[PDB]
Design a protein around this ligand. Structure first.
Ligand SMILES: O=c1ccn([C@@H]2O[C@H](COP(=O)(O)OP(=O)(O)O)[C@@H](O)[C@H]2O)c(=O)[nH]1
Ligand SMILES: O=c1ccn([C@@H]2O[C@H](COP(=O)(O)OP(=O)(O)O)[C@@H](O)[C@H]2O)c(=O)[nH]1
Ligand SMILES: [Fe+3]
Ligand SMILES: [Fe+3]
Ligand SMILES: [Fe+3]
Ligand SMILES: [Fe+3]
Lengths: 194, 194
């Protein structure tokens, strides 16, 4: 059960999250919970760890810049983090808010949440399931989601590659800064597109 | 004169380069020589250093992988370079072939050639002139070259930003690895698009 990892039931957590998140964002988390479970079954990841990490991944999406900055200092995180924003923070720093609020201590779950946005050069299968589930969950409808879905039905590694390529391409198209760890992910996985 | 920097006249160099490069690539170098001179006048860079670096930037474009690998060892370059190819090598490693063949010792010229493909987080005005001249030289006709040209008429820094964004966007679109120093350039310059 979820109480095996956190300080409340799934139902209690959902009530908590309905307070913290707009309806669309909660619906997203619910979709990721479901998609993570499906991927975990396909690729031999603990379905329960996957479901829970999937539900929790965007827990900290609505924290303010001020809160994240507090957390960086208190937890003595990489100082460079101040140069970034929500996109990087909600996973990389947001895991600390999760730990505080829910007493989550499992390192594998914490890590999968931590890098859900940016990835890493080395990712566990659980990290990959969450990274991909976020992108393919049933509520998403962005052009090309169908391709991501088909890829993910066959290969976790190629799904990570496709999503990361698309993200880098779009950030450059938009003229947004690219977190260097995103590029570590890109370069590690891009060969899977071949 | 060019003999102020290298071991032969401009005419002798052109004869040398006609041996080393296909006609299209030599025509490109000639275009970059011209474009570098124009940019240097606009942005207060030594026109002679700019012209010479512009002409020489793609000198080593046709070396074989084997030659570059020799040069990496002999000059004891970053070992990671072996993981890459021509695109990175022809500037980053190719500067050594230039030094050997032509007795080029000027550090500013050598540096502008070195990073003409990948840029750096910190670039001298000369580095920027070469980086941009390569992209806007009159023989180029890629869609959007007109925009690059207009930008470069106003701002060296914004031209670096636009070119780097386009390069990162296209590499991700194609599913090609991105040299980490390219991202250093991207993140340093991307703010200029605003
Ligand atoms: O290096 C970076 C910098 C920014 N973003 C952006 O972060 C946002 C949120 O990404 P996530 O995968 O966490 O999805 P969401 O929380 O919106 O479901 C997206 O708009 C990304 O383009 C990113 O993915 N990588
Ligand atoms: O991190 C990288 C990896 C590859 N390339 C590629 O290197 C090639 C040559 O770039 P350059 O600016 O040296 O132009 P050229 O020599 O073709 O005139 C282009 O196709 C680029 O997309 C790049 O610019 N950055
Ligand atoms: Fe997220
Ligand atoms: Fe999400
Ligand atoms: Fe080049
Ligand atoms: Fe060139």
């Amino acid at each position: 059960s979820y109480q095996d990892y956190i300080n409340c039931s799934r139902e209690a957590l959902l009530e908590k999250m309905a307070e913290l998140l707009p309806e669309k964002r909660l619906t997203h988390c619910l979709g990721v919970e479901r998609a993570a479970m499906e991927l975990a079954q396909r690729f031999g990841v603990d379905v329960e760890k996957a479901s829970l990490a999937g539900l929790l991944h965007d827990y900290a999406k609505k924290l303010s810049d001020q809160e994240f900055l507090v957390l960086i200092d208190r937890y003595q995180l990489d100082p460079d983090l101040k140069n970034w924003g929500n996109n990087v923070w909600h996973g990389m720093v947001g895991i600390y808010k999760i730990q505080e609020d829910l007493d989550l201590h499992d390192s594998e779950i914490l890590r999968a949440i931590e890098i859900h946005t940016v990835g890493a050069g080395q990712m566990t299968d659980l990290d990959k399931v969450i990274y991909v589930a976020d992108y393919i969950e049933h509520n998403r409808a962005f052009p090309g989601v169908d391709v991501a879905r088909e890829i993910a039905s066959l290969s976790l590694n190629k799904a990570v590659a496709y999503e990361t390529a698309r993200t880098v391409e779009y950030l450059a198209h938009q003229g947004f800064p690219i977190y260097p760890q995103t590029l570590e992910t890109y370069n590690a996985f891009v060969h899977y597109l071949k």
